[PDB]
Amino acid sequence: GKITVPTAVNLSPISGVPEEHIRERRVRIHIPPKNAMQSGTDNVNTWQIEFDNRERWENPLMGWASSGDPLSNMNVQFGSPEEAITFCERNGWRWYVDGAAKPKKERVKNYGINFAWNKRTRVSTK
Amino acid sequence: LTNKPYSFVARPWEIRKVSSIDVLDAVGSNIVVSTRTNEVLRILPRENEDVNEEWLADKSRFACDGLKRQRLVAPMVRMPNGELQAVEWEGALIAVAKAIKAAGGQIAGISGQLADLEAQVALKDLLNRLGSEVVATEQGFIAGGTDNRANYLLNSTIAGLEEADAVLLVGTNPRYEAPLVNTRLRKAYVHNELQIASIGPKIDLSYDHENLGADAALVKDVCSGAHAFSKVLEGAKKPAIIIGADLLERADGAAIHATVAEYCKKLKKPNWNPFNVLQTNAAQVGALDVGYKAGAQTAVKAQPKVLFLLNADAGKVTREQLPKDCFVVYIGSHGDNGASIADAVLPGAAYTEKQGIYVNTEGRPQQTLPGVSPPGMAREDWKILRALSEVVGKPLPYDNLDELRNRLEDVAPHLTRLGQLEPAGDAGIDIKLKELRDYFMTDAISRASPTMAKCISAVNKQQRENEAKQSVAI
Amino acid sequence: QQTLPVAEVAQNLPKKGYSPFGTKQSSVAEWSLARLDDLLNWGRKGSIWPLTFGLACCAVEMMHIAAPRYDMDRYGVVFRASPRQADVIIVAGTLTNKMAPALRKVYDQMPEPRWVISMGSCANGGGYYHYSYSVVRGCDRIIPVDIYVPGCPPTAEALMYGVLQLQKKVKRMKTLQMWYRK
Amino acid sequence: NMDYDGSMIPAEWYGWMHYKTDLPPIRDGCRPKYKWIADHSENLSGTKEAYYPYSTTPNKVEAWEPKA
Amino acid sequence: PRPLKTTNPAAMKRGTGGRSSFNGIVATVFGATGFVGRYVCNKLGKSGTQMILPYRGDDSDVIRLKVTGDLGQVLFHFYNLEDPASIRDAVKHSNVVINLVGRDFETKNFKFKDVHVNGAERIARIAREAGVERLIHLSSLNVEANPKDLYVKGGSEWLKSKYEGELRVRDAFPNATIIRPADIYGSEDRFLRYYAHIWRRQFRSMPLWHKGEKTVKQPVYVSDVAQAIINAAKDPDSAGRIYQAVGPKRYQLSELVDWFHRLMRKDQKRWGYMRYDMRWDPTFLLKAKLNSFICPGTPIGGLHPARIEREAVTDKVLTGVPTLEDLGVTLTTMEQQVPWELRPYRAALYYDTPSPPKCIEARDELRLFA
Amino acid sequence: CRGDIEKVTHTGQVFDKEDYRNARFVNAKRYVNENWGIKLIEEVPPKECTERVVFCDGGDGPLGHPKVYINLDKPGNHICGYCGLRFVKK
Amino acid sequence: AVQQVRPILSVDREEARKRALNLYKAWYRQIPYIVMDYDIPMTVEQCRDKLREEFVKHRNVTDIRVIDMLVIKGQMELKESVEIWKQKGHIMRYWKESQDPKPTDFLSKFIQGV
Ligand SMILES: NC(=O)C1=CN([C@@H]2O[C@H](COP(=O)(O)OP(=O)(O)OC[C@H]3O[C@@H](n4cnc5c(N)ncnc54)[C@H](OP(=O)(O)O)[C@@H]3O)[C@@H](O)[C@H]2O)C=CC1
Ligand code: SF4
Ligand SMILES: [Zn+2]
């Protein structure tokens, strides 16, 4: 007992997203930036989708920051960009990709170039 | 070692990290901005091997203190008393519309040092819809270089400049104009046997170089083949010639742009374009992409009744060059200079407060992202220009940013592929930046920052201390 | 603040008396209305009947003022199940989105004068489910609240301190003096 | 009279009345009795002298004054 | 080019428009505990306006207004109308002052001149001395310099008092917006509750002046006039402009009262509904005078003779003077809102949809008044 | 007049007279601490020491701040970053 | 671009449209009981206009499982409306009450900051 369907669906009516959030929100699919003061990269390999920043204002009473955007704190993790594309087209979001990952940076690290003859790669300290 | 402007301010888990680009230098370096609870905390490098390579200049990094001082929070209209007063948005828009209708099609507009690409497109569409065919930019350029892209691009890649074998600098100091290009040249200096010659005054590049002289016509000797560095340039595996934009703004200009281009047509390698130009303004490449007539004198000599300005604080235009009545509308974020002479000072958002495109010196378009909200009632500049076009009576067709990007596809297909560089074809003495204190306060955000003033005060204090200790021994 | 008075200073201070208004009224009609309002507020503070409105954990402490150690019954305070017979509603627990029209209808069917005690961080300010999808951010957005008892499960001395603060508010109610000055 | 509440007890006798310690301040010497210790105050809420919150940081964004 | 006052960037408009946002308005709604005050307080609190809210009586009559605004957007302040220092303390940090201070009957402490004439002029001059940018004051529709009596002797003191108070407000505060409501209907009002009360009727029969046929009234909803007050406070082109606050269609009083009794299921034949002339019945005026006498506070049902003369006076609009549709508010029609108001007021059905009322046009009104 | 509104705090904050946010203090007192930390840490004298490196505990062992070691080779007053006590070497 | 899935509550689009018409028929029959049994200001004609507006809002959908999901949620809301579990405030959530109508022009959004 199976039927025939297209593989591309639109789940925006059956979800709880109102029209004012499905019609004008841009989704950024991106790899999060590595913290430049750290040398680790275990939080970089996971792709994630996030939403565009909206208006955040000073509270009139206290000094807190108030925002009427419900989706400012929602980052959704994915293992590949194409699954994020499938998720964004399935939930009806308007998507864009910030940038693909760097494929390969071929680098060589030799200890002998620090102490070289007739070369300008010789170090002055140790 | 700790960030002293970012002394005791916040903590890493508290930080919202937003990926954007820096507009202070020419590199267009990818940055991550630390925003927490509607406040810019610090600016950190973002990883890209093609543009910045995990490094950041000091003007790029310590300009976050300038986003709090001398900001524009209210629209200001010059009263008949003589001083600007804070005026609500509808009154300011109908005042600019009344001055536009009183001008009668004799209007002009000048782009800025830190202006957005989309703001420049909105300004050009507003002026072209109002019967004005003249637009301008603060920093000048050669005549006829707008038609081909390779006239105004760093055509050799910043990632490729680390593979250079012999590079010639024609009247520029790259460590104070765009220092990450100087990091690439320093890497190519230490890793490859590179010989570098500079034409102009005595400058320090942080590595050794042969100073040919300050004479202009010596570069013709480099195009003659009789000079000793010309043999090194023709014998190089991957040679390059870099020309500063300030040398192209001078009256010789296009002539010095022509001859070395012919020299580039004498020395070319496959998958390598050796002609290079380094232009300090981040908005200059995008403005010349969308078709801006470069030079503020093109708008000065047109005698405009209403002179539009984007975020322009270079001060190349003043009240004396302008006529007796001139409704100067300044659409900027800080307005240290160029807003005191303006009659309708409109506010604006900075590069951390709005979403827009910037094109760097190599021609790679990149997109900044809004970190924090603009202070007061400041809006985005393209929204301001679209609302002004709706008040005037000839509205621009785009309503949101998506149709503005569609019009960007309509005017230039390579201005929307963000992060992707399309290589161009062939391209057909004093330096204003030679010291660190000259480097610190080039832009408006760096001028409004107290950190750069503290840096110049500390450097000058060390200079008088060293001069006193040297002169006490004499 | 003010420094609480030192006993050398406080021995020179006279006695406060029961009446917050004082017996120094000028007119005899104003004095008679002041004493009638004092008797009316004494009758109202002498027996407030809170309503059995226990939403969540805070209510487990609410029964602990029913308990023999704290003994709310010697303060005029005794629970009533019907909202008509009750003076006070003690919001003791977590007001949710499905709970909002029930609380509003129960408060509206209560007869006036109506004092409301917010018991616990879920009752005032939202608390530990303040960023939840189905929790009202405090009951102050729906029901007007006179006393706010602070602790997440308020100790029962602190809830009874809120009850005594409500009794001091009821004793400070000025109705007939306002009628004379209306 | 009749205006007493549970906040009239000072800080030094609060642990004695609440069975935290069994040492009164007339015998216990562990209390700090420093110079900057403020005197005790009752719950001032509901009066014309209660506490009302405010933002404690100064203004972050400094505007530009056309003058100067 | 309208200039800004203080250009403090912690005091400009921010946010989307909910409770937590701020629209740059600091309102001081005088008499906010009343019938129009509740609706204008909720309408101001739903947009993000901080209100100071000075109250005169007890705290229990004003503590219900804390649910309208967000945290810190609702304040309270004790004041007396005869005391000027408390009013100056109330309005010293405001830019919009809304004056709803009024009373339909004379009081032993405050007369009509002490509320409408002296009090509103005192509030207006204190707000002018305190640097308040805009003031909103409310009057009556049919204000005249010398309004004549129609049925009751001693009547129309309220209309003369409101006209003199409006003149003293425009003499004190020049840029003061004067909204003139005709007759405001809604829940907890003095129109539908006054025609809904047992004490208004007389043995299941309602007396009406000339059987209700002569007077033509154009009543307005309280949400419409609250939206008009907010639209006058936000838009600054409404400085010193009189706004006639009237409803969409004109109705005569007989058809209105018959439609009300059709809504309350009084049209059944066992109830014995009868409409008769008021001028033949002095017992009703004697009952109204005794009700104004024996009641210490407000009279029951609002059956003071000022309400009698107000229902005697027809609603007359002035040509060339703006209407609330120039303030950009869509007026709610009567037939949508009124059955919801009179749904709890319906009688029990006897053991043995209503027709909509007939509107009166201009030519039919001219034929009726001929 | 009330002197508790215009009084500055130790964070350098005061509501000016043109601010709308001083209307919240017309019925409630503005709470300003009169015991500033700057004067109360400038009031104590610096501690003179003879050894090159010292340790600051801030009081009792488990009840103080975590232990730090300050090097007093540089002339002047060296301030502990935890408690603010100043040490000096003769 | 074609996958075989398990059908939910339908096997063809005509059957799904027929069951949506069953849902609309039952909602249209339940309108005057909703107006009678709730203390709401909206009348019968306004309720029928709101029902037509919510159906033509979801007119645009095409997929069988999505339209069956919509029919299932509509029948659940209807079952919450026949048996009175929703309140007067839950019924009046379809009409966007207590909400200022946001402007669509660029000038009013530019003045208001939206
Ligand atoms: N049918 C109507 O509603 C019409 C009304 N108007 C006008 O609209 C305005 C508002 O009417 P509305 O709210 O319905 O009437 P209300 O009588 O119900 O409200 C008047 C408000 O003013 C306060 N108040 C009354 N007298 C004084 C006084 N002497 N000193 C201080 N405050 C006082 C009342 O406080 P408290 O809580 O103590 O009573 C109340 O908050 C009035 O100016 C009225 O003349 C005009 C035409 C028709
Ligand atoms: S405030 Fe604390 S104790 Fe009370 S209901 Fe909430 S979680 Fe429970
Ligand atoms: Zn220490």
Give the separation between CA B31 and CA B35, rounded to whole angstroms: 12
Nearest to B346 by CA among B68, B116, B76, B70: B76
Looking at ligand 2, which atom is closest to the CA of residue C121?
Answer: 1
Give the separation between CA E366 and CA G37, rounded to whole angstroms: 44
Neighbouring residues of G54: CB distance < 8 A, sequence distance ≥ 6: G94
Cα E96 vs. chain centroid, distance in angstroms? 19
Nearest to E252 by CA among E303, E287, E304, E211: E211
Q: Could you tell me the sign of the dihedral formed by the alpha carbons of B224, B229, B232, B237, in that order?
A: negative
Neighbouring residues of B316: CB distance < 8 A, sequence distance ≥ 6: B138, B296
Place of tokens 């508790």: F4
Work out the number of other CB atoms within 10 angstroms of the CB of residue B17: 16
CB-CB under 8 Å, A120 with B189: yes
**Are the CB atoms for F54 and F70 separated by under 8 Å?**
yes
The number of C-alpha atoms within 13 Å of A59 and in the hemisphere containing its C-beta is 17
CA distance A1 to chain G (A): 7
CA angle, residues E215, E219, E221, in degrees to nearest 5: 170
Strands (E), B282-432: 306-309, 327-331, 344-346, 356-359, 365-368
CA angle, residues E48, E54, E60, in degrees to nearest 5: 95
Q: Could you tell me the sign of the dihedral formed by the alpha carbons of D66, E2, E5, E6, in that order?
A: negative
Give the separation between CA B356 and CA B338, rounded to whole angstroms: 23
Place of tokens 């003499």: E171
Give the separation between CA D44 and CA E111, rounded to whole angstroms: 38
Give the separation between CA C154 and CA C168, rounded to whole angstroms: 20
What does the block give as tokens for C163?
């009850």
3-state secondary structure chain A: CCEEEECCCCCCCCCCCCHHHHCCCEEEEECCCCCCCCCCCCCCCCEEEEECCCCEEECCCCCCEEECCCCCCCCEEECCHHHHHHHHHHCCCEEEECCCCCCCCCCCCCCHHHCCCCCCCCCCCC
Nearest to E223 by CA among E324, E307, E97: E324
* Backbone angle region of B144, left / alpha / beta, with phi > 0 → left and psi within -120 to 50 → alpha: left
DSSP labels, chain C: --PPPPHHHHHHSPP--S-SS-S--SSHHHHHHHHHHHHHHHHHHH---EE--B-STHHHHHHHHHSTTT-GGGGT---BSSSSS-SEEEEES--BTTTHHHHHHHHHHSPSS-EEEEESTTTSS-GGGTT-TTB-S-GGGTS--SEEE-SSS--HHHHHHHHHHHHHHHHT--SHHHHHT-
| C139 marked as part of a ligand binding site | no
What does the block give as tokens for F9?
């705090």
CA distance G18 to chain E (A): 33
Alpha helices in B50-88 (DSSP H): 58-61
> How far, in Å, from the CA of E186 to the mean position of ligand 1?
15
Neighbouring residues of F76: CB distance < 8 A, sequence distance ≥ 6: F88
Kindly report the backbone phi and psi dihedral angles of residue B273, in degrees, each rounded to the nearest multiple of 5, phi listed first. Answer: -110, 105
Kindly report the backbone phi and psi dihedral angles of residue B384, in degrees, each rounded to the nearest multiple of 5, phi listed first. Answer: -65, -45
Chains that touch C (3 or more CB pairs under 8 A): D, E, G
**Are the CB atoms for G106 and G113 separated by under 8 Å?**
no
**Are the CB atoms for B115 and B311 separated by under 8 Å?**
yes
DSSP labels, D3-66: ---TT-S-HHHHHHHTTS-S--TTT---S---TTPPPP----TTSTT-B-----S--SS-B--S
CB-CB under 8 Å, G100 with E47: yes
Q: Is C105 exposed, middle or buried (0-12, 13-18, 19+ CB in 10 A)?
A: middle
Neighbouring residues of B75: CB distance < 8 A, sequence distance ≥ 6: B86, B87, B88, B89, B92, B344, B345, B346, B347, B377
CA distance D24 to chain F (A): 23
Rounded to the nearest 10 degrees, the angle between the axes of helix E35-45 and helix E222-234 is: 50
Kindly report the backbone phi and psi dihedral angles of residue A89, in degrees, each rounded to the nearest multiple of 5, phi listed first. Answer: -75, -25
Ligand 3 (ion): residues with CB under 5 Å are F 56, 58, 80, 82-83
Give the separation between CA B178 and CA B175, rounded to whole angstroms: 6
Give the separation between CA B153 and CA B285, rounded to whole angstroms: 8
CA distance B46 to chain G (A): 31
> How far, in Å, from the CA of C70 to the mean position of ligand 2?
20
What does the block give as tokens for B389?
């076009």
Element (H, E) at G4: strand G2-5
Give the separation between CA E300 and CA E295, rounded to whole angstroms: 8
Counting every residue written for chain B, the total comes to 474
Element (H, E) at B274: none
**Are the CB atoms for A6 and G63 separated by under 8 Å?**
yes
Give the separation between CA F45 and CA F36, rounded to whole angstroms: 17
Cα B466 vs. chain centroid, distance in angstroms? 34
Neighbouring residues of B235: CB distance < 8 A, sequence distance ≥ 6: B166
Counting every residue written for chain G, the total comes to 114
| Specified resolution (Å) | 3.3
Of the ligands numbered here, which is closest to the C-alpha atom of C128? 2
Neighbouring residues of C140: CB distance < 8 A, sequence distance ≥ 6: C118, C124, C125, E66, E67, E71
Give the separation between CA E121 and CA E142, rounded to whole angstroms: 20
What does the block give as tokens for B47?
């990883």
* Beta carbon of C127 within 6 Å of any ligand 2 atom: yes
Neighbouring residues of C125: CB distance < 8 A, sequence distance ≥ 6: C137, C138, C140
CA angle, residues E137, E139, E141, in degrees to nearest 5: 140
Give the separation between CA B164 and CA B107, rounded to whole angstroms: 46
* Backbone angle region of F58, left / alpha / beta, with phi > 0 → left and psi within -120 to 50 → alpha: left
CA angle, residues B243, B247, B252, in degrees to nearest 5: 115
Place of tokens 């009641």: E295
Q: Is E237 exposed, middle or buried (0-12, 13-18, 19+ CB in 10 A)?
A: exposed
Give the separation between CA E62 and CA E76, rounded to whole angstroms: 8
Q: Could you tell me the sign of the dihedral formed by the alpha carbons of B350, B355, B358, B364, in that order?
A: positive
* Beta carbon of E186 within 6 Å of any ligand 1 atom: no
> How far, in Å, from the CA of C102 to the mean position of ligand 2?
19
Neighbouring residues of E287: CB distance < 8 A, sequence distance ≥ 6: E202, E303
Give the separation between CA B384 and CA B120, rounded to whole angstroms: 12
Nearest to B311 by CA among B329, B297, B293, B326: B329
CA distance D1 to chain E (A): 25
Q: Is B56 exposed, middle or buried (0-12, 13-18, 19+ CB in 10 A)?
A: buried
Q: Could you tell me the sign of the dihedral formed by the alpha carbons of C103, C104, C105, C107, in that order?
A: positive
> How far, in Å, from the CA of E33 to the mean position of ligand 1?
8
Give the separation between CA G24 and CA G75, rounded to whole angstroms: 10
Chain A interface mutation, best of D54, D55, D60, highest count of A Cβ atoms under 10 Å: D55
Give the residue from chain E lying closest to B71, CA to CA: E9
Cα B368 to Cα B28, B173, B332, E141, E291, distances in angstroms: 10, 27, 17, 58, 74
**Cis preceding-peptide flag for C113 (omega within 30 of 0):** yes
User: Looking at beta carbons, which residues of chain C come within 8 Å of E107?
Assistant: 182
Give the separation between CA B41 and CA E82, rounded to whole angstroms: 53
What does the block give as tokens for A26?
């841009």
Alpha helices in E222-330 (DSSP H): 222-234, 253-263, 282-294, 305-312
Give the separation between CA B33 and CA B46, rounded to whole angstroms: 9
* Beta carbon of C120 within 6 Å of any ligand 2 atom: yes
Place of tokens 């002018």: E128
Nearest to F67 by CA among F45, F89, F82: F82
Give the residue from chain G lying closest to B378, CA to CA: G113
Which residues is E274 bridged to in the sheet? E205
Place of tokens 């002797």: E153
Cα G1 to Cα A9, A82, B315, C12, G60, distances in angstroms: 11, 16, 60, 94, 21
β-strands A56-58, A65-67 pairing? antiparallel
β-strands B40-45, B30-35 pairing? antiparallel
CB-CB under 8 Å, A55 with E71: no
Give the separation between CA C8 and CA D19, rounded to whole angstroms: 29
Give the separation between CA B214 and CA B200, rounded to whole angstroms: 4
Q: Can you count the helices (H) and strands (E) in chain B?
A: 16, 17
Cα A36 vs. chain centroid, distance in angstroms? 16
**Are the CB atoms for B383 and B126 separated by under 8 Å?**
no
**Are the CB atoms for B327 and B92 separated by under 8 Å?**
no
**Are the CB atoms for B357 and B365 separated by under 8 Å?**
yes
> How far, in Å, from the CA of C155 to the mean position of ligand 2?
12
The interface residues of chain G toward chain B in range 22-41, judged by CB-CB distance below 8 A, are: none
Kindly report the backbone phi and psi dihedral angles of residue B190, in degrees, each rounded to the nearest multiple of 5, phi listed first. Answer: -80, -30
* Beta carbon of C128 within 6 Å of any ligand 2 atom: yes
**Are the CB atoms for B160 and B131 separated by under 8 Å?**
no
Neighbouring residues of A36: CB distance < 8 A, sequence distance ≥ 6: B32, B44, B45, B46, B47, B54
Give the separation between CA C93 and CA C118, rounded to whole angstroms: 9
Give the separation between CA B433 and CA B33, rounded to whole angstroms: 27
Give the separation between CA B430 and CA B199, rounded to whole angstroms: 9
In single-letter form, the type of residue at position E74 comes to V
- Ligand 2, atom 8, lies closest to the CA of C57
Place of tokens 């001929």: E370
Q: Is B369 exposed, middle or buried (0-12, 13-18, 19+ CB in 10 A)?
A: buried
Nearest to C97 by CA among C133, C127, C126: C133
Which residues is B77 bridged to in the sheet? B85, B344
β-strands B344-346, B76-78 pairing? antiparallel
Give the separation between CA A72 and CA G7, rounded to whole angstroms: 36
User: Looking at beta carbons, which residues of chain D come within 8 Å of B373?
Assistant: none
Neighbouring residues of F53: CB distance < 8 A, sequence distance ≥ 6: F69, F70, F71, F72
What does the block give as tokens for E252?
């005569």
Q: Is A19 exposed, middle or buried (0-12, 13-18, 19+ CB in 10 A)?
A: exposed
Give the separation between CA E29 and CA E65, rounded to whole angstroms: 12
**Are the CB atoms for F68 and F82 separated by under 8 Å?**
yes
Which residues is E216 bridged to in the sheet? E252
Nearest to E254 by CA among E218, E220, E285, E208: E208
Work out the number of other CB atoms within 10 angstroms of the CB of residue G102: 12
Q: What is the DSSP letter of B288?
A: H
> Is A8 an interface residue toward E (CB < 8 Å)?
no
Give the residue from chain A lying closest to B34, CA to CA: A35
Q: How was this structure determined?
A: cryo-EM
Kindly report the backbone phi and psi dihedral angles of residue E288, in degrees, each rounded to the nearest multiple of 5, phi listed first. Answer: -65, -40
* Beta carbon of C58 within 6 Å of any ligand 2 atom: yes
Q: Residue B146 in 3-state DSSP?
A: coil
> Is B334 an interface residue toward D (CB < 8 Å)?
yes
Which residues is B135 bridged to in the sheet? B109
Cα G35 to Cα E335, E349, F36, G32, G89, distances in angstroms: 15, 19, 66, 5, 13
Give the separation between CA C174 and CA C176, rounded to whole angstroms: 6
Radius of gyration from C-alpha coordinates of chain A: 23
